[PDB]
Amino acid sequence: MKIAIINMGNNVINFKTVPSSETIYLFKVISEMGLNVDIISLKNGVYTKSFDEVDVNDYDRLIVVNSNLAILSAQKFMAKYKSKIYYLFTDIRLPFSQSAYLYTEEELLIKSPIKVISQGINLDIAKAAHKKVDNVIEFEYFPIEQYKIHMNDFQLSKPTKKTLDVIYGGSFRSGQRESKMVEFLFDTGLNIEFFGNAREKQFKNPKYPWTKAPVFTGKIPMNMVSEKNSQAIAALIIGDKNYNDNFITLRVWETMASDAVMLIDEEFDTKHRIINDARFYVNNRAELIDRVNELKHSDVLRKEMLSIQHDILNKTRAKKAEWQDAFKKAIDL
Ligand SMILES: O=c1ccn([C@@H]2O[C@H](COP(=O)(O)OP(=O)(O)O)[C@@H](O)[C@H]2O)c(=O)[nH]1
């Protein structure tokens, strides 16, 4: 049984960009499952083989991720593949999709059936997002994002000195989460830092007025996110509208593993699936401020909440074998 992983829109070579790093970490976890796997990309190197040096059909299972040469090559490669394509649906804004003088569609048209492995539990949302796909398509839920906590070298963050009140790391996401970012992170009167690719100048929509913004700092490597989260008393979990009561995102685990107390927007998880404890949830800005002040003022509460969230994380890690079994079942092995 031979498996190939391709990133449909980004080049994979090193840990320099985020889309390249998650493909390599996905590749690492699948390898640690005891599977023979290769990443196919633009060039040959320590982590990859080139599209030109392999025969797509030598692979029994083709896994496709997403996060222009990379886009044109992957399509030509997939267009020649004669079996089912397993698409990892990890971001609502990136459903599977078919992308001029240099191109013929008989060379780029993908006719294979596609199995969408949705990171969100609500398959109707995944189906609605893939409405335009002409292909034969099937859907299945798999919590792909747990890959980080199941890696062999995973470890919780240690207690660290606090220099911030609340931290959130991420990008602007085309303004898809602007109302939520402004509500929980702007005008709080607290010491907040927003790290990642966002900038203050992007927050320009007149519908969400604000006076003072959080401090914006640059991006950091994926493997340093929990350590960065750890410099704060609390770290925020918010999501796009279609992630609510649907997607558990990577930040949930990155935060849970950190030394920062995880504070979750109520609307993201109304049933309280993540942690069945109301102390970890906030409905709005007023509640976030009060919760952060309670945590800054009672070490007994902060330590208890950290202890509880680390316990939930360890409980989940304890099921690594079942998680690995389900992933193999999802890819028909
Ligand atoms: O400086 C940074 C900021 C974010 N991230 C990664 O980007 C993810 C956030 O992605 P996004 O902003 O799209 O938000 P999501 O939809 O995952 O909540 C984080 O979980 C990190 O893994 C990173 O590696 N470096």
XYZ file of C-alpha atoms and ligand atoms in Angstrom:
358
model
C 0.000 0.000 0.000
C 1.591 3.253 -1.169
C 0.286 6.730 -0.282
C 1.038 10.142 -1.849
C 0.197 13.612 -0.400
C 0.124 16.708 -2.602
C -0.618 20.299 -1.610
C -2.956 21.640 -4.317
C -2.084 25.305 -4.076
C 1.287 25.786 -2.451
C 4.850 24.605 -2.990
C 6.226 22.242 -0.340
C 9.891 22.345 0.467
C 10.784 23.388 4.016
C 9.285 24.841 7.223
C 9.459 28.423 5.774
C 5.780 29.080 5.061
C 2.645 27.829 6.938
C 1.056 25.817 4.069
C 4.369 23.997 3.464
C 4.826 23.218 7.207
C 1.368 21.694 7.729
C 1.825 19.415 4.658
C 5.114 18.188 6.133
C 3.612 17.740 9.627
C 0.604 15.900 8.072
C 3.112 13.809 6.151
C 5.055 13.160 9.432
C 1.994 11.982 11.422
C 0.766 9.695 8.603
C 4.330 8.216 8.376
C 4.310 7.687 12.157
C 1.061 5.696 11.611
C 3.310 3.156 9.908
C 2.306 4.004 6.360
C 4.599 4.204 3.304
C 4.048 7.788 2.130
C 5.721 10.402 -0.110
C 4.909 14.113 -0.639
C 4.821 15.023 -4.343
C 5.718 18.650 -5.115
C 7.530 20.882 -7.613
C 11.035 19.734 -6.764
C 12.977 16.870 -5.275
C 14.499 17.533 -1.825
C 14.704 16.123 1.692
C 10.896 15.972 2.102
C 9.610 15.760 -1.429
C 9.668 13.984 -4.819
C 8.799 15.934 -7.999
C 5.682 15.429 -10.084
C 8.025 14.529 -12.936
C 9.988 11.827 -11.159
C 7.059 9.675 -10.021
C 4.169 7.966 -11.812
C 0.943 9.165 -10.128
C -0.528 5.780 -10.702
C 2.175 4.006 -8.640
C 0.209 5.278 -5.624
C -2.726 3.347 -4.154
C -4.129 6.363 -2.273
C -3.747 10.052 -3.268
C -4.350 12.517 -0.397
C -4.844 16.181 -1.342
C -4.490 19.221 1.050
C -4.857 22.964 0.375
C -3.687 26.142 2.163
C 0.613 29.426 -10.608
C 3.040 26.428 -10.851
C 1.913 24.498 -7.762
C -1.755 24.770 -8.751
C -1.204 23.884 -12.465
C 1.082 20.874 -11.694
C -1.110 19.282 -9.038
C -4.114 19.457 -11.405
C -2.199 17.865 -14.279
C -1.001 15.151 -11.862
C -4.435 14.511 -10.412
C -5.935 14.607 -13.912
C -3.864 11.569 -14.800
C -4.641 9.661 -11.581
C -7.226 6.877 -12.171
C -8.570 6.324 -8.677
C -10.393 8.211 -5.938
C -8.967 11.470 -4.649
C -9.076 11.998 -0.841
C -9.459 15.692 -0.152
C -8.711 17.006 3.379
C -11.262 19.804 3.921
C -9.612 21.857 6.700
C -10.636 25.454 5.883
C -14.180 26.516 4.910
C -12.771 28.983 2.362
C -10.919 26.238 0.554
C -13.271 23.543 -0.788
C -11.992 21.189 -3.579
C -12.287 22.964 -6.924
C -11.272 22.745 -10.605
C -9.123 25.791 -11.513
C -4.770 29.939 -20.707
C -2.795 29.443 -23.964
C -0.525 26.827 -22.388
C -3.369 24.565 -21.246
C -5.721 21.926 -22.633
C -8.519 20.742 -20.336
C -8.034 17.053 -21.294
C -4.734 17.686 -19.498
C -6.270 19.508 -16.503
C -9.826 18.116 -16.076
C -10.110 15.817 -13.028
C -12.649 13.037 -13.651
C -11.981 10.986 -10.529
C -14.462 10.532 -7.734
C -13.602 12.676 -4.700
C -14.020 11.827 -1.032
C -14.096 14.965 1.075
C -12.833 14.271 4.558
C -14.356 17.136 6.442
C -12.740 18.521 9.590
C -16.227 19.808 10.539
C -18.848 17.348 11.971
C -21.690 18.983 10.058
C -21.588 17.384 6.583
C -24.333 19.611 5.256
C -21.998 22.569 5.508
C -19.253 20.597 3.707
C -21.766 19.588 1.002
C -23.003 23.155 0.568
C -19.409 24.337 0.152
C -18.793 21.741 -2.628
C -22.127 22.521 -4.477
C -20.397 23.407 -7.770
C -18.181 20.309 -7.994
C -19.358 18.266 -10.933
C -17.484 15.204 -9.757
C -18.908 12.178 -8.065
C -18.279 13.185 -4.471
C -18.740 11.588 -1.033
C -18.298 13.049 2.469
C -17.002 11.843 5.760
C -16.029 13.524 9.026
C -12.567 13.062 10.532
C -10.924 15.354 13.153
C -7.788 15.935 11.033
C -6.632 18.827 13.202
C -5.627 16.560 16.097
C -2.513 15.679 14.078
C -0.531 18.153 16.208
C -1.300 16.499 19.555
C -0.678 12.967 18.310
C 2.783 13.651 16.882
C 5.459 11.548 18.602
C 7.377 14.561 19.851
C 4.387 16.497 21.322
C 4.665 18.086 24.794
C 2.695 20.526 26.919
C 4.054 24.008 27.551
C 5.609 24.631 31.011
C 4.590 27.448 33.372
C 5.869 30.726 31.959
C 6.135 34.336 33.213
C 3.095 36.401 32.186
C 3.618 39.603 30.234
C 0.250 39.785 28.493
C -3.416 39.429 29.425
C -4.923 37.935 26.212
C -3.267 36.670 23.036
C -4.619 35.586 19.636
C -2.500 34.429 16.733
C -3.737 34.243 13.164
C -4.434 36.028 9.937
C -7.166 38.490 8.838
C -8.992 35.784 6.791
C -10.352 38.322 4.234
C -12.402 39.916 6.981
C -14.452 36.745 7.462
C -14.051 37.024 11.264
C -13.760 40.817 11.635
C -16.849 41.336 13.852
C -15.581 38.706 16.290
C -11.997 40.031 16.328
C -13.132 43.585 17.015
C -15.594 42.448 19.711
C -13.141 40.379 21.777
C -9.772 41.906 21.099
C -10.334 45.650 20.530
C -11.248 48.304 23.133
C -10.939 45.969 26.116
C -8.617 48.162 28.156
C -6.536 44.961 28.598
C -3.006 44.157 27.401
C -3.674 42.192 24.229
C -1.419 41.060 21.404
C -2.561 39.763 18.019
C 0.331 37.869 16.338
C 0.320 36.473 12.795
C -0.333 38.059 9.428
C -2.941 40.640 10.408
C -2.282 44.381 10.578
C -4.239 47.212 12.140
C -4.866 48.878 8.752
C -6.895 45.892 7.598
C -9.547 46.597 10.235
C -11.352 49.228 8.151
C -15.055 48.091 7.958
C -17.341 50.931 9.179
C -19.859 48.437 10.606
C -17.524 47.517 13.459
C -16.288 50.738 15.109
C -13.321 50.741 17.525
C -11.030 53.278 19.219
C -8.009 51.312 20.427
C -6.565 48.188 18.732
C -4.529 45.366 20.229
C -0.743 45.386 19.563
C 0.004 43.626 16.244
C 3.238 41.618 15.994
C 4.598 39.429 13.212
C 4.178 35.799 12.283
C 6.094 33.091 14.026
C 6.756 29.498 12.953
C 3.998 26.958 13.455
C 6.053 24.984 15.933
C 6.412 28.020 18.252
C 2.652 28.913 18.533
C 1.938 27.253 21.886
C 5.090 28.817 23.353
C 3.962 32.241 22.095
C 0.392 31.628 23.464
C 2.019 30.857 26.809
C 3.156 34.382 27.441
C -0.475 35.396 28.185
C -2.938 34.738 31.024
C -5.573 33.652 28.439
C -5.795 32.940 24.672
C -8.971 33.395 22.625
C -10.836 30.831 20.508
C -13.155 32.378 17.881
C -14.095 31.072 14.408
C -15.813 31.919 11.105
C -19.631 31.639 11.164
C -19.625 28.208 9.487
C -17.115 26.789 12.026
C -19.596 27.323 14.877
C -20.780 24.036 16.363
C -18.954 22.345 13.475
C -15.114 22.707 13.247
C -12.660 22.180 16.107
C -9.715 24.144 14.780
C -5.957 23.615 15.298
C -5.888 26.625 17.595
C -8.093 24.734 20.067
C -5.256 22.209 20.632
C -2.429 24.769 20.315
C -4.161 26.777 23.037
C -5.144 23.839 25.199
C -1.515 22.625 25.213
C -0.240 26.078 26.203
C 0.207 27.723 29.594
C -2.585 30.140 28.668
C -6.166 29.499 29.846
C -8.392 28.751 26.876
C -11.340 31.181 26.673
C -13.884 30.182 24.030
C -16.515 32.349 22.323
C -19.932 30.799 23.369
C -21.299 30.944 19.794
C -18.310 28.758 18.546
C -19.329 25.880 20.783
C -22.860 26.352 22.218
C -23.177 22.750 23.430
C -19.817 22.999 25.236
C -18.209 19.966 23.422
C -14.599 21.143 23.985
C -14.722 21.412 27.783
C -17.969 20.882 29.696
C -17.230 23.767 32.156
C -18.883 27.211 31.863
C -15.830 28.975 33.274
C -14.024 28.533 29.944
C -16.739 30.324 27.869
C -17.444 34.013 27.226
C -20.384 35.583 25.372
C -19.021 39.020 24.683
C -16.390 41.649 25.469
C -17.719 42.466 28.999
C -17.501 38.817 29.970
C -13.980 38.367 28.526
C -12.710 41.371 30.562
C -14.276 40.050 33.804
C -12.965 36.493 33.228
C -9.400 37.727 32.508
C -9.555 39.884 35.662
C -10.711 36.874 37.760
C -7.807 34.796 36.384
C -5.251 37.601 36.993
C -6.528 37.992 40.574
C -6.841 34.304 41.690
C -3.917 31.906 41.084
C -6.038 29.119 42.520
C -8.640 29.616 39.663
C -6.047 30.050 36.873
C -4.093 26.982 37.931
C -7.256 24.874 38.316
C -8.480 25.853 34.839
C -5.041 25.124 33.340
C -5.005 21.758 35.108
C -8.505 20.935 33.708
C -7.705 21.898 30.117
C -4.406 19.925 30.200
C -6.375 16.888 31.485
C -8.874 17.075 28.569
C -5.884 17.262 26.194
C -4.193 14.202 27.745
C -7.471 12.263 27.686
C -7.666 12.958 23.921
C -4.026 12.014 23.374
C -4.712 8.707 25.156
C -6.916 7.692 22.184
C -4.155 8.076 19.555
C -4.617 4.457 18.455
C -8.311 4.916 17.796
C -7.626 8.186 15.991
C -5.008 6.493 13.751
C -7.472 3.592 13.044
C -10.212 6.019 12.044
C -7.877 7.975 9.685
C -6.912 4.716 7.894
C -10.625 3.786 7.667
C -11.365 7.250 6.228
C -8.827 6.624 3.424
C -10.282 3.113 2.711
C -7.443 1.010 4.212
O 2.216 33.727 13.551
C 1.471 32.786 13.385
C 0.027 32.826 13.519
C -0.719 31.713 13.243
N -0.125 30.528 12.840
C -0.925 29.355 12.488
O -2.108 29.783 11.835
C -3.222 29.206 12.491
C -4.402 30.125 12.451
O -4.997 30.124 11.162
P -6.201 31.127 10.793
O -5.752 32.505 11.078
O -6.629 30.810 9.401
O -7.375 30.756 11.849
P -8.306 29.466 12.135
O -9.322 29.468 11.062
O -7.423 28.304 12.123
O -8.843 29.755 13.465
C -2.783 28.990 13.878
O -3.554 27.969 14.500
C -1.334 28.609 13.724
O -1.187 27.188 13.534
C 1.251 30.416 12.709
O 1.794 29.350 12.438
N 1.978 31.557 12.987
